[PDB]
């Protein structure tokens, strides 16, 4: 029968970034970055990925601040929320990209580039391999649950609007978003995936897994930074140093 989408969810969808514009902007930036460099100062694959991730985070901040509800918080509240979840949002973004755009044995990047598992299997160290292995496990789980765009945007809001952060001033708005987004997500899964009787619960149980992978990713990056591998003026490093 007909699909049903809660009104609230429609409102969340409206806040979504223009995916093709972000992709083209990030690719063009990286291509111009590399072209501006002489032969001996070209960025490595890692250096390029660091700049790519930085640009993705810029995009995430711009998504949040233009988002319904979030844009109504004072900057200090906005900062506390983003300080808490920035890496989880990066991970959720990456994971969802694989769920929608990914093909067996490869990884799809924000630039629209595709990277063969084998290329990674060979040139990546054990730390990154472990990270990617856990990310791939979550991707398989979500594909299996038929994770979709409507559920994706609800989870992004639930990750952003955390009641577990200290010294939040407008906690009532945060409570409100948690209450209403949870409700809309539940109504959505019950109506549209009625054969999967526990889909709602199953989706929520992915959240601590997202946190775990985000912590692992932060740790990997911090280590790379301590080795002097991360290019200068990295916004991810500023988020880490906070």
């Amino acid at each position: 029968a007909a699909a049903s989408i809660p009104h609230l969810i429609l409102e969340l969808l409206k806040c979504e970034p223009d995916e093709p514009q972000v992709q083209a902007k990030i690719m063009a930036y990286l291509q111009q970055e590399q072209a501006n460099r002489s032969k001996h100062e070209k960025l490595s694959t890692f250096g390029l990925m660091c700049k790519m991730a930085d640009q993705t985070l810029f995009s995430i901040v711009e998504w949040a601040r233009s988002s319904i509800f979030f844009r109504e918080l004072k900057v200090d509240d906005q900062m506390k929320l983003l300080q808490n979840c920035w890496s989880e949002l990066l991970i959720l973004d990456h994971i969802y990209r694989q769920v929608v755009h990914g093909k067996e044995g490869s990884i799809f990047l924000v630039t629209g580039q595709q990277v063969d598992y084998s290329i990674i299997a060979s040139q990546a160290g054990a730390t990154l391999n472990n990270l990617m292995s856990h990310a791939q496990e979550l991707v398989a789980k979500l594909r299996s649950l038929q994770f979709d765009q409507r559920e994706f945007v609800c989870l992004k809001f639930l990750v952003l609007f955390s009641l577990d952060v200290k010294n939040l001033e407008n906690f009532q708005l945060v409570e409100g978003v948690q209450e209403q987004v949870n409700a809309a997500l539940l109504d959505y899964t019950m109506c549209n995936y009625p054969q999967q009787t526990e889909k709602f619960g199953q989706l929520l149980l992915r959240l601590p897994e997202i946190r775990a992978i985000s912590m692992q990713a932060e740790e990997y990056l911090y280590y790379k930074h301590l080795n002097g591998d991360v290019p200068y003026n990295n916004l991810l490093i500023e988020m880490l140093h906070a």
Binding site: R65, V75, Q78, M79, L82, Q83, L235
Partner: peptide, 10 residues
């Protein structure tokens, strides 16, 4: 976090 403040407040 000065940069984060700026990105939001601008």
């Amino acid at each position: 976090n000065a940069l984060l403040r700026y990105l939001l407040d601008k």
